[PDB]
Assembly symmetry: D2
Homo-oligomer: 511 residues x 4
């Protein structure tokens, strides 16, 4: 379903191909294929004129060899798939002078489920990581390993099973394959996709929190925000109105007639820059996704090639720095909401630590769960520190005196996202238990579905389905401490978010 | 020339009023004044109904008193003028319920040159800071000091000299004056203004650097950047083309026919996110400058008031974090250029440390100056750290469980900008000296004006004028070490940039 | 061999038990066992007086249940073994009121090779992590999983295979088991152990670097350092003298008769605070290893118990913050050395990027390897950021308004150490290749063993043995780019350091 | 009173000379003066043998000139006096080869009250800053300015008023004066002094807080800390016992018979690493103060000179990073105490925001003051970031590929200390007001002196003296909001702490 060459790829496109195994196909547009061939002819005819052919090919092949110096853990398969999709997407522009056959090799690997192994260390922002993909694609040596739908195999063996012949890199092809920002951008693309989703879910968590705390909806009145018209603020306030519409737990005051802490009253003002910043990043990453990043670039129309520096992924490096920074801020705001919920002094009447069965004097509720949340949030703000500014000025014989650190900035971002998925699962558990207890205080039973706004009811129910605890008027989500292993619930919720399950579908409208 | 009430204020408008003493006038538009009066009537009539009048006034007056708890150094006078301009601009929206007479008081202070003393510590993001301005405007007590065109005076005395009577705050007026983001935003506004100017100068510096290093202009060819179309990158590359147009020191290769380090070849790619980031910040600050930030907001059309949280300056807090982060990145890149210039191994033939008179074996050139630059740049990346994420969740009786730290973020940003003005001055000195030595190596004389692109020639000459060293074919900017105090030059250049002198006018087109 | 109860445990003791499976035994000292029993009698008799028995036991058991809220990846088995060793060590002090039978359970688990699974998230500095160990030790439920010499198994099943009966926690026993700093400290202990080793190896690397660069040994002359007598500096200078003693690659100038960059000439001064800081940390951690951290503490001699806060692991939190900070500094200094080695302009005659076979014009040497080092070092400085200062003041119903973040600080440190092992492997590879090329330039052959100081020869040869490349006069370590996968070498060296192989034994004297 | 040359200087010695104008005198010990002369003879006789004499002097003089490139604000006078004291102290070791007459010049300047102006920017860790001192001492040119007991004057004019003749630098004298860590260390010395004082006052603040909160003294019982024997923790616990001895506001429970938040119960555990860290830093700074840091070093006994790198101030750079980190931690802990005091939910019965006159329904108490405190603390943790790890590897023609950033680290530390003095003033105000209100709740009157422990009574009264508010049974420190400007009080207390007034004397025993 995803065609490469015609229209620009979106972050959503990359995600589907990387995470869902969506099939890919190179465009059949003759004009595109023509350009691709045309740039190759330029390099070929350049070799026929003006420093040889075989020597020029040996050089490209040796590039793969001295670059096989990766280290550390392997990148997740999804990120390597995203990188191949982007590398191919870049080539289709017809300015890299690479054979269509090599570009097709990536389509084949992506559709066949063959993913080259790539290391997390090696790039200052992606020669080294891309060399592992290159070497695997061409079947250079058995030392190059790949994952073929499940188990480890050497590149040559996969190429045999695919009934494909090894390839020999022609002049420029090595650089066309290994010079560029495809890997760091692929990682970043998936990070942004996941963060947009977690932000939507976080909005749903805040909507649950507001209801459990009996907060007012007056803070989201359009008059307030239109007077301070920041797009992200306007958006956040309007989304909360929709998330709280028809709720029986919020005190309705849109008519005009402080008790609410700032974490509720200033929610739109706080989230505004975060939402806008994530949107800015998404936009910048989408441009990077569709950029030609190798070097030199071939300009056929003028029969010339130019030496530039499009291989510097500064937008990804700084973009991911901001992304991690935004995530920390989202987590801290969510953690403060949990603090209000867990403390009798500020929860407006809820049981201490959202205890369920008051009868059992031994129960402590979600006290342990808050502590876990309190342990993860600071780590997220820790990851919100930057790395683009810490670039080494003496890199590569002092030739790369500036570099983006985009690759590690992206891998750090993947770590932040993975941690944030666990944190949001915790925030979701607090919000779900809290509304059941508030519903009880209001109606005498524990079925929050009878009072929740229809929008938050969808999320509430999705969470209860995932953990396997069906809402009942007789009991809230968590009753006695010894009836469930909260770790199992965190793990199940997090797994569902990562897989785009019912929890994600439930907030599909906030995206 | 600057009218408040009709059109939205721009960053440029604020800078002119704050730094240049541009006169301000409230709009005469009857519809605007009507709105202002209307919100006052709402509050008055609200006091006539439904908790008293005198008691309600005493409360507002006492607000000024318990808020007189500032500490630290005083804010620069320009930032306070900016704060008043914004506070008044906010009131003209007619949703604050403040008397036109109180708003007019700020107009009078601005035009009369009366600036209340305000402290750097006190706001978590601006009750405390604004309370000093409020107390001064109304002449509450002699304890409130102000600057009246030069010397310290107590507020009451200033009001007497202005032939104005002290004022008594009516219900809501205290909150309308002290609730809001006017001070942090005013500070941020001036910061963005100065940074836009410094960024333009930095571009001019890189242009001098490229020429002195005999770099190629090929890296800026439109084909390269149109294939990686990030707006900031495209802009950076195009601006450099213009800055380098008609230069005799650059090797012209726009025709298509690596030696250049990444700091030159990847300049557009690196500056792209920075330029775009500064633009994003500017847009967000301009919205903040024109927003109503007090509380509660008065909606006359519906005869109602709403309690919201527009006083949270999250966009300023995170925006200034980003701004300091961008400044650090700009400085580190500029430092890497200086390193190429000063080292024979990488300067492509320039004298070590840009020494002038080789005859005097004792001369060491700009070795000391480089060290000074090397000491300032790391400090700027240090200030590039963030503070928004470090907000105290236990603030104000746990009521302000989220705050923006916007005030200190803006003050930290003012420190970064002030330091960066000194740093850019140093970079300007290295660029000027370097082009004279390159010109000599190319023509046998030291008059760079005969080889520089016209665009950089304006900057080059503006600098030479400021330091008071006239370019001559016989001698370069710096000849013997004992002939000038480089500290004086850094100081003069820095002062001219801060004052918007000839150096700034010289790059007026890059803005 | 490691007995618990008599003498204080050392970091070396913890490492052996955690990593080498060294057997442990509780002391037979009757006085110690008496104290243990005595504190239990205090609690028992306290239950017999003055709030019940069964209710008091249910409370302790329920503690294990609501604390089963861990999340994220599992901790390495070694850290869990260290945690158990420390918990038991703490109990032997006789101030916890826990049955010898429960303390013995940990001895059995350690000796049997049974390691409870513990999550990386859950502690703010170790209730949650310790609850997993507790629940596994007592066989509370099948939900508690452990590793029994290789494969997963539930606690109950493990206890059955060990012929042990499940246990029921008596009053105070739950708190005695789960209240404390054992896990964070066990993690910290292994980190310190590994960092001391990496520091010794780094010294060896610098020794190889100095020789390859033909640096002088004059910088290490005792007169210089005795005039600036910082203990770590004095130590570093003296160790380098020993490491360089009898080298034929260093220019001998201890007789008194600038060319050397600061990374060589200021090595002792730079390493001094790092070596001293690491020593300070080790000392603090050893005290924490032997401290009683549960609460309340039982003081039998005075028949009383005190409520205190020994469970706050501030020394571990801040200690690990410093540790990561020191590691970053070690890596950065090492990276600058590599930069000198790889660049002809600064290597004092070595081939560019330490290329081996100049004949093959395609060879690029260790250019890729340097890029990899350049990508890892900045990440290490990134991890050198702190987390103790980012503690959440609203933690656990606002009861834990201060906490150490010791647990995550320790896990972050484990990440730093793991990353630094890969980095040092790269630094080792650069040093070994470099001395072969210097030996060649000096003698016409590549057997560095003929010119290296005996001390560095040991390290040199250990590295060559591990990668499987025997030194020969005919060829250096790296000849042609296509003859090896440098990634395999990085991995082998790193594995050897982590296992305490020949590379570690080779620097056994620098420890 | 302070003699240089015989015994090692202590931080206290430096502070007295720098801040109190204590007179200095060079030692008369003939052996010391002999060593000083001996090293000069070595250099002289070295010039008589084996470069040119005059040429060697011109070189040293030129050094002063190309190094006159400082920028930014001037250093405080006290820091410059400290720098001169340390420089002279270094020369007395007799290994520098500098004339006694030049060392005497610094003695004269210190005793005459002549302080050379020195800039904050210029050193990467102190050539540039030291060049300003040098040039002023020798009266090189009118461009060098100094402060002579009050007003600006040029160096030559000062030398004339002192009846001293300008001096000419002989070989090595330029390097002996400008190579070194004297300025950064002098700055650091004063920072450590002030921080030791602030830490002692903070302990007193915690003591007032504990009493006002009716906390228990059980948490400090020796049995608890002797079981977790970290020297700093043991020290903190014991000091608090002394600070709380005989208090009638604390609940006495040293007999053995949780309510207290961690900030009270875990105070010793938290402060321990801070106290120990500050002690470690002090010890390292005292060694640096007595070290010879110029180069090359002259070894007369062996008639030789050695080129080393003692001028790298790594201990100061990393030491000041830690110092700022510790300050941030101290402030955050103190802020959490203020939060407990201000909130009725946690203050154990104190009025909200420590309001005084409940009768006036308009009074809000110290609400504004808490906000100011909340704005300062986060800034201190921001400054707790490090700078040593951010050193530029391309510094000074790539010769200084490692540097300590010790100078800016020290200046940043001076900023932290200055800010912390304001913060502690605020903390003191909260503690004083708080104990008056607790005393009232306990006895019916507001004279805390009747219930406070004698140790805290001293501090309490010192503060009340400073602000000019005499304790009375009829009224507490703060009664009505409009009766005082809290900013004046903050300013007065801060000023007294900085001057070492009664507030400092009050805690002289905790130092």
């Amino acid at each position: 379903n995803v065609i490469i060459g015609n229209q620009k790829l979106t972050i959503n496109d990359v995600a589907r191909v990387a995470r869902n195994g969506t099939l890919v196909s190179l465009t059949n547009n003759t004009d595109i294929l023509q350009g691709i061939q045309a740039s190759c002819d330029y390099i070929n005819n350049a070799v026929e004129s003006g420093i040889s052919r075989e020597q020029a090919s040996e050089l490209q092949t040796n590039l793969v060899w001295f670059l096989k110096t990766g280290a550390g853990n392997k990148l997740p398969l999804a990120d390597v798939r995203a990188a191949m999709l982007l590398r191919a997407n870049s080539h289709m522009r017809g300015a890299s002078g690479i054979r269509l056959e090599l570009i097709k090799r990536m389509e084949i690997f992506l559709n066949a489920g063959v993913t080259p192994y790539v290391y997390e260390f090696g790039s200052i922002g992606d020669l080294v990581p891309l060399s592992y993909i290159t070497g695997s694609l061409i079947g250079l040596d058995p030392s190059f390993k790949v994952d073929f739908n499940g188990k480890e195999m050497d590149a040559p063996t996969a190429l045999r099973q695919l009934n494909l012949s090894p390839l020999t890199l022609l002049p420029k092809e090595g650089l066309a394959m290994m010079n560029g920002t495809s890997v760091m951008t692929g990682i970043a693309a998936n990070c942004v996709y996941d963060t947009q989703i977690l932000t939507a879910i976080a909005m749903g968590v805040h909507a649950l929190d507001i209801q459990a705390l009996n907060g007012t909806n007056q803070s989201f009145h359009p008059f307030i925000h239109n007077s301070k018209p920041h797009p992200g603020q306007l958006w956040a306030a309007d989304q909360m109105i929709s998330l709280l519409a028809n709720s029986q737990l919020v005190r309705d005051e849109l008519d005009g007639k402080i008790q609410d802490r700032y974490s509720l009253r200033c929610l739109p003002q706080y989230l505004g820059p975060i939402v806008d910043g994530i949107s800015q990043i998404a936009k910048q990453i989408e441009i990077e996704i569709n950029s030609v990043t190798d070097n030199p670039l071939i300009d056929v129309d003028n029969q010339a090639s130019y030496h530039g520096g499009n291989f510097l992924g500064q937008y990804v490096g700084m973009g991911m720095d901001h992304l991690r920074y935004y995530i920390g801020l989202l987590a801290k705001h969510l953690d403060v909401q949990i603090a209000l919920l867990a403390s009798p002094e500020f929860s407006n009447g809820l049981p201490p630590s959202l205890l369920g069965n008051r009868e059992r004097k031994v129960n402590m509720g979600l006290k342990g769960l808050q502590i876990c949340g309190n342990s993860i949030m600071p780590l997220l703000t820790f990851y919100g520190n930057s790395i683009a500014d810490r670039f080494p000025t003496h890199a590569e014989q002092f030739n790369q005196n500036i570099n983006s650190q985009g690759y590690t900035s992206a891998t750090l971002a993947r770590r932040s996202v993975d941690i944030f998925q666990n944190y949001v699962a915790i925030a979701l558990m607090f919000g779900v238990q809290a509304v059941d207890l508030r519903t009880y205080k209001k109606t005498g039973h524990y079925d929050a579905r009878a009072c929740l706004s229809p929008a938050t009811e969808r999320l509430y129910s999705a969470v209860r389905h995932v953990v396997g605890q069906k809402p009942t008027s007789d009991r809230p989500y968590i009753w006695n401490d010894n009836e469930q292993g909260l770790d199992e619930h965190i793990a199940r919720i997090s797994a569902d978010i990562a897989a785009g399950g019912v929890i994600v579908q439930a907030v599909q409208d906030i995206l």
